[PDB]
From a paper:
Major histocompatibility complex (MHC) class I molecules (MHC I) present antigen peptides to the surface of antigen presenting cells (APCs) to active T cells through interaction with T-cell receptors (TCRs), which play pivotal roles in antiviral defense. In this study, we screened bat MHC I Ptal-N*01:01–binding peptides from different bat-borne viruses (HeV, EBOV, MERS-CoV, and H17N10) and determined the structures of bat MHC class I complexed with these viral peptides. The overall structures of Ptal-N*01:01 display the common characteristics of classical MHC I molecules in other mammals, with the extracellular region of the heavy chain folding into three different domains. The α1 and α2 domains construct a typical PBG that contains two α1-helices and eight β-sheets, and the α3 domain and β2m display typical immunoglobulin (Ig) domains and underpin the peptide binding domain.
Although having different lengths, the 8-mer peptide HeV1, 9-mers HeV2 and H17N10-NP, 10-mer EBOV-NP1, and 11-mer EBOV-NP2 in the PBG of Ptal-N*01:01 all display an M-shaped conformation, with P2 and PΩ residues as the primary anchors and the P5 or P6 residue as the secondary middle anchors. The P1 Asp of all of the peptides adopts a rigid conformation upward to the α1-helix of the heavy chain. Detailed analysis indicated that Asp59, Arg65, and the P1-Asp of the peptides in all six structures of Ptal-N*01:01 form a triangular network of hydrogen bonds. The lengths of the Ptal-N*01:01–binding peptides cover a range from octamers to tridecamer. These peptides possess an Asp at the P1 position (with Gln in one peptide: MERS-CoV-S4), an aromatic aa (Phe or Tyr) at the P2 position, and a Pro or Leu at the PΩ position (C terminus of the peptide).
Numbering used by the authors:
A (entry chain C): 1 to 11
B (entry chain A): 1 to 277
C (entry chain B): 1 to 99
C-alpha cells in the first residue's frame, strides 16, 4: 500500500 | 535474513510545458512491483510484477485504495512544489524537483528492523524523519517551514503508524505472493572473453550475467594479487528481464594470460568462483 | 545541483547473429529527471522503443532503462543517443557486443 491520504497537506 | 519494502516519489514542475508531473514506484528489495504516473488520462496504480498481476484478488479493493492514495500524493507534491518554491523565493520560470523515499526493513523473524522517510529538493537532502520515527531533521532554513507545519499537524506519528503497520504487513504479503521471484538467489552465468588490441596487448573481460539480487563482487588478480586499480569495473546494470549484469576487464600483455584469475562472489553461488583463460 | 548521465549500451543476452534479443541503453546518475534517449539502427531512430519507470538511487540521482527487441547481424550497427540539460551536445554510444 502507498501510504494513505496525507489529508491534503502542504510542505 | 532481511527484506525491504520501498516507495519512491518524483514530482517536478515544467513551466510553459503543462502542469507538474508525479511518478511513483514500489519495490520489494531489487524488484519493482507497482507504478503510478499522473500524466496518464485517468491515472491508476498499475502492477509491474508477475505476482501482482495474478494473485492480487486476496483484496478486491487494493487497486482502488492505492489509486486514491497515489492521486492524493500526486496533488500533495504538486502543491508542495509551489510551497518549496515560495520558501526559497524562486522564480516560477524554473523547473524544480521533490523526491521522496520511504519504507520498512524487516528481519528474519518477520518483525520490523527499521523504518525510514526521506525527502530531497532539487536532488539535495531536504527533510527526513529521524531514527526515533518521532521528529524531523530539516536540511536548511526553508525546510524549517515544512518541519513546523508537519510537527503542528502531528505528521510524524501517522508516519510511524504506517511504517510499523501497513508497511511491514504488506511487505510480508508481497514476500508470500511473490516468493518465486523475491525469495530467489540466481547465481551469475560467468565467463571470460578475449579481445586482442595489438600483437603486444590483450583485453580480458570477466562477465557475470543474469544474476539476482544486485549485490555481487568481481575482482581480477595477477598470480594472487588484486588488481582493482588496473582493472575497469562497470556499474551493475539491469538486463531488462528482472536480473542484473556486470563485467570487469583488464589489459594484460600478450602471452601473459594463464595468470590473472577472475574471482566472482554472489549469494547464489555454492562457493566463490575462479575463472582463468 | 545538476548531474550528467552515465550511459551503457548492451544486449540482454550474449550477441548471437540472427537470433532475437533485446537492445538496452541504461542511463544513470543524472539530475534533473527529464532526459532524451533514442535507440539508433545504422544512424536512424528506432520507432518501437520503451523504457522502465523512473526511479532513483540513494544519492537521489535518477536511472532509466530504454530497450527494444532486435536481432543483430554482422553489418547492422546499433547505438544509443542521449541528451540532457547538463550535456551541451548529445552523446552517442555505439553498441559493442564485446561490452
Amino acid at each position: 500500500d502507498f501510504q494513505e491520504s496525507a489529508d491534503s497537506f502542504l510542505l | 535474513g532481511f527484506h525491504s519494502l520501498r516507495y519512491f516519489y518524483t514530482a517536478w514542475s515544467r513551466p510553459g510545458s503543462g502542469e507538474p508531473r508525479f511518478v511513483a514506484v514500489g519495490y520489494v528489495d531489487d524488484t519493482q512491483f507497482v507504478r503510478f504516473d499522473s500524466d496518464n488520462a485517468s491515472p491508476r496504480a498499475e502492477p509491474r510484477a508477475p505476482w501482482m498481476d495474478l494473485v492480487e484478488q486476496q483484496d478486491p479493493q487494493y487497486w482502488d485504495r492505492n489509486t486514491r492514495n497515489a492521486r492524493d500524493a500526486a496533488q500533495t507534491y504538486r502543491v508542495g512544489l509551489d510551497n518549496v518554491r515560495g520558501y526559497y523565493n524562486q522564480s516560477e520560470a524554473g523547473s524544480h524537483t521533490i523526491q521522496r523515499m520511504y519504507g520498512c526493513d524487516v528481519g528474519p523473524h518477520g518483525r520490523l528492523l527499521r523504518g525510514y522517510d526521506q525527502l530531497a529538493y532539487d536532488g539535495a537532502d531536504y527533510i527526513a524523519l529521524n531514527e526515533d520515527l518521532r521528529s524531523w531533521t530539516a536540511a536548511d532554513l526553508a525546510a524549517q517551514n515544512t518541519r513546523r507545519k508537519w510537527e503542528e499537524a502531528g505528521y510524524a506519528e501517522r508516519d510511524r503508524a504506517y511504517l510499523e503497520g501497513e508497511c511491514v504487513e504488506w511487505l510480508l504479503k508481497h514476500l508470500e505472493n511473490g516468493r518465486e521471484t523475491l525469495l530467489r538467489a540466481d547465481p551469475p552465468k560467468t565467463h571470460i572473453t578475449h579481445h586482442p588490441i595489438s600483437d603486444r596487448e590483450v583485453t580480458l573481460r570477466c562477465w557475470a550475467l543474469g544474476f539476482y539480487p544486485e549485490e555481487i563482487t568481481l575482482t581480477w588478480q595477477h598470480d594472487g594479487e588484486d588488481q582493482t586499480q588496473e582493472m575497469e569495473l562497470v556499474e551493475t546494470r539491469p538486463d531488462g528481464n528482472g536480473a542484473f549484469q556486470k563485467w570487469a576487464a583488464l589489459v594484460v600483455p600478450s602471452g601473459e594470460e594463464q595468470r590473472y584469475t577472475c574471482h566472482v562472489q554472489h549469494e547464489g553461488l555454492p562457493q566463490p568462483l575462479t575463472l582463468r583463460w | 545541483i545538476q548531474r550528467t548521465p552515465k550511459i551503457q549500451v548492451y544486449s540482454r543476452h550474449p550477441a548471437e547473429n540472427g537470433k532475437s534479443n533485446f537492445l538496452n541503453c541504461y542511463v544513470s546518475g543524472f539530475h534533473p529527471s527529464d532526459i532524451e534517449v533514442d535507440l539508433l539502427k545504422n544512424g536512424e531512430r528506432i520507432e518501437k522503443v520503451e523504457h522502465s519507470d523512473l526511479s532513483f538511487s540513494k544519492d537521489w540521482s535518477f536511472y532509466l532503462l530504454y530497450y527494444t527487441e532486435f536481432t543483430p547481424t554482422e553489418k547492422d550497427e546499433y547505438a544509443c543517443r542521449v541528451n540532457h540539460v547538463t550535456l551541451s551536445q548529445p552523446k552517442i554510444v555505439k553498441w559493442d557486443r564485446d561490452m
